[PDB]
C-alpha cells in the first residue's frame, strides 16, 4: 500500500503544481491585467492589491 | 476619490463626463426655457421704437 500510497501522492502531487503553476500564471497576468487596468486607471488600485 | 483607492480614473471620468454631459442638456432646456419665455413675455408691446401710438 504505502508503495502505492505516496507513489500516487507524488504524481497527484505533480498534478498539483501543474495546476497551481498554471494557476499562478492565471493570477500572474491576472495581476498584470490589474496593473495595466490600474496603470491606465480604468480600474482601482485596490484590485491590484 | 480621485487618486485615492476606488475612484478608478476612467470610471471617474465617466461621471465628470456626465456632469459635463447633462449640464449641456441643462444648456438646452434653459435655451428652450429661454426660448419659450421669449415667446411668452414676448406679448407684446413695444416694438423697437418709442413714440406716438
Swiss-Prot record, chain A:
- The domain of life is Bacteria
**Which organism encodes this protein?**
Escherichia coli (strain K12)
Q: Which residues of the full protein are shown?
A: 347 to 395 of 493
Task performed by this protein = Outer membrane channel, which is required for the function of several efflux systems such as AcrAB-TolC, AcrEF-TolC, EmrAB-TolC and MacAB-TolC. These systems are involved in export of antibiotics and other toxic compounds from the cell. TolC is also involved in import of colicin E1 into the cells.
Q: Impact of altering residue 47 to A?
A: Decreases inhibition by hexaamminecobalt(3+)
- Complex and partners: Homotrimer. Part of tripartite efflux systems, which are composed of an inner membrane transporter, a periplasmic membrane fusion protein, and an outer membrane component, TolC. The complexes form a large protein conduit and can translocate molecules across both the inner and outer membranes. TolC interacts with the membrane fusion proteins AcrA, EmrA and MacA.
Q: What happens when the gene is disrupted?
A: Cannot grow on efflux substrates novobiocin or fusidic acid.
Protein's name in the database: Outer membrane protein TolC
Localization, per the record, is: Cell outer membrane
Q: What is known of its domains?
A: Forms a continuous, solvent-accessible conduit: a 'channel-tunnel' over 140 Angstroms long that spans both the outer membrane and periplasmic space. The periplasmic or proximal end of the tunnel is sealed by sets of coiled helices.
Q: Which family does it belong to?
A: Belongs to the outer membrane factor (OMF) (TC 1.B.17) family.
From Swiss-Prot, chain B:
Question: Which subcellular locations apply to this protein?
Answer: Cell inner membrane
Description of how the protein assembles with itself and partners: Monomeric in solution. Homotrimeric; interacts independently with AcrB and TolC as well as AcrZ. Part of the AcrA-AcrB-TolC efflux pump.
Functional note: AcrA-AcrB-AcrZ-TolC is a drug efflux protein complex with broad substrate specificity that uses the proton motive force to export substrates. This subunit may act as an adapter protein that links AcrB and TolC stably together.
Which family does the similarity line name?
Belongs to the membrane fusion protein (MFP) (TC 8.A.1) family.
Tell me what this protein is called. Answer: Multidrug efflux pump subunit AcrA
Span covered, complete protein: 132 to 184 of 397
Amino acid at each position: 500500500q504505502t508503495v502505492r500510497s505516496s507513489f500516487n501522492n507524488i504524481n497527484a502531487s505533480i498534478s498539483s503544481i501543474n495546476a497551481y503553476k498554471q494557476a499562478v500564471v492565471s493570477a500572474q497576468s491576472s495581476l498584470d491585467a490589474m496593473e495595466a487596468g490600474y496603470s491606465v486607471g480604468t480600474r482601482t488600485i485596490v484590485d491590484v492589491l | 476619490l480621485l487618486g485615492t483607492q476606488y475612484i478608478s480614473k476612467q470610471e471617474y471620468d465617466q461621471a465628470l463626463a456626465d456632469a459635463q454631459q447633462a449640464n449641456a442638456a441643462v444648456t438646452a432646456a434653459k435655451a428652450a426655457v429661454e426660448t419659450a419665455r421669449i415667446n411668452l413675455a414676448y406679448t407684446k408691446v413695444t416694438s423697437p421704437i418709442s413714440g406716438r401710438i
